């Protein structure tokens, strides 16, 4: 619901939603939006839909379908280099979706915008070092850039405090034409736990596990740390509930 509420941020200003210990329904979110492009790295998309892992990390931003290739760790495109990076070590699933007309409460930004270049001038006048975004981190040059880039060509500069480093930080702003239907890119970086699986798919429990399915039948019961062989018969409640 927080992802649905409000307006999705730009790729550089992407907000982070983290779910550690809750039942998850990725399929329901996939049903709500129309996903034009689905891809995953280090795991199957079907496996990601139905598996238990220690934690789930979801990043939501407005990304157009046309520049999806640029935002890849393998790609040398500037947007991936200076805006959003996804950790290679954790399995990463990348989903691009277009909001349906029926879906409501999704505010649309005036245009999609990205940081064309992020660089820091060195203390030496003739020396400049480019700054490359580390995994996530919301981008190094995000502070100079406004939430939506004002013009297709923009120049941003700010000066770091000396000692350190007393070096100007320079950023570029670029924009792309807004699509009639808003397009949003989602980056997911779930972390698997060898001994811990706090977040599990909805609904993990099944009818066979439920006593009502096996009522009247000799069955093995493993409920709340008690293991035994017994037959369950429906009867009037007795004892402390």
């Amino acid at each position, epitope marked *: 619901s927080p992802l649905l509420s409000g307006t999705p941020p730009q790729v550089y200003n992407f907000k982070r939603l983290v779910f550690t210990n809750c039942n998850y329904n990725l399929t329901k979110l996939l049903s709500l939006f129309s996903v034009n492009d689905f891809t995953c790295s280090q795991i199957s998309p079907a496996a990601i839909a139905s598996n238990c892992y220690s934690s789930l990390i979801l990043d939501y931003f407005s990304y157009p379908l046309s520049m999806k290739s640029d935002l890849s760790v393998s790609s040398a495109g500037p947007i991936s280099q200076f805006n959003y990076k996804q950790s290679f070590s954790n399995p990463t699933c990348l989903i691009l979706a277009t909001v349906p007309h029926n879906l409501t409460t999704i505010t649309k930004p005036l245009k999609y915008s990205y940081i064309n270049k992020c*660089s820091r*001038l060195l203390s030496d*006048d003739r020396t*400049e070092v480019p700054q490359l975004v580390n995994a996530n981190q919301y981008s190094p040059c995000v502070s100079i850039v406004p939430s939506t880039v004002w013009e297709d*060509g*923009d*120049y*941003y500069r700010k000066q770091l405090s000396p000692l350190e480093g007393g070096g100007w930080l320079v950023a*570029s702003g670029s924009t792309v034409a807004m699509t009639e239907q808003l397009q949003m890119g989602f980056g997911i970086t779930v972390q698997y736990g060898t001994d811990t699986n706090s977040v599990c798919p909805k609904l993990e429990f099944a009818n066979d596990t439920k006593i009502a399915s096996q009522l009247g039948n000799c069955v093995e019961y493993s409920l709340y740390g008690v293991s035994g062989r017994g037959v369950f018969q429906n009867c009037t409640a007795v004892g402390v509930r």
Partner: antibody
Amino acid sequence: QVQLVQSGAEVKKPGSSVKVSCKASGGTFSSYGITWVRQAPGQGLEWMGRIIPILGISRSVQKFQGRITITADKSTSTAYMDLSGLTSDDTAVYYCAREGGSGYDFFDYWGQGTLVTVSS
Amino acid sequence: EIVLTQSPGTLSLSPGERATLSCRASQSVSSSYLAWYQQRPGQAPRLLIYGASSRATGIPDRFSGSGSGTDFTLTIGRLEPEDSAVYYCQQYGSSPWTFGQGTKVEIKR
């Protein structure tokens, strides 16, 4: 403070490729944008193009877009504009002005200027 | 691109008399996004006020920027022969930024 200087005035035939050169003094380029301004005689100044050498980005006015190629290099320390296919009416004095940034489009210093006349 | 009205231009002004220049904008522009440029005859324009709020470094305090949104007025506390020049108001709120038509100032001692 960097003093701003411009190439000597030149005369070219209409449609010829003409380059106006503005050089940052000291052999090094500060982290500032470079703007090109065309002023027609007895007329208000008109912005032609904006190039930042450190950024490497190039921008041009809608009136004169794609007829001018602008290249600025920090290592060269010189920002130059190349204009090709310009009409005879286009002749005007050209000025290069320092830019604080997109948020600060005011020019603290202006180049001496180059007068280019296009006539056959 | 915003079309901007300008003061008529050449005026006869005695020294020590305040001078006001009008820079109305047909299209709405940012409340403080206007640059004043003064060019001496055969000289490059030099910024006097940035944002029509504060004088640029090395510019006399007598020149002042007043007005917001549509009409911008440049008022000079004292007038000198050196003060006489052509003044342009540039609105950088909308790109491409549009320079003022300009107003020649004449001082006859």
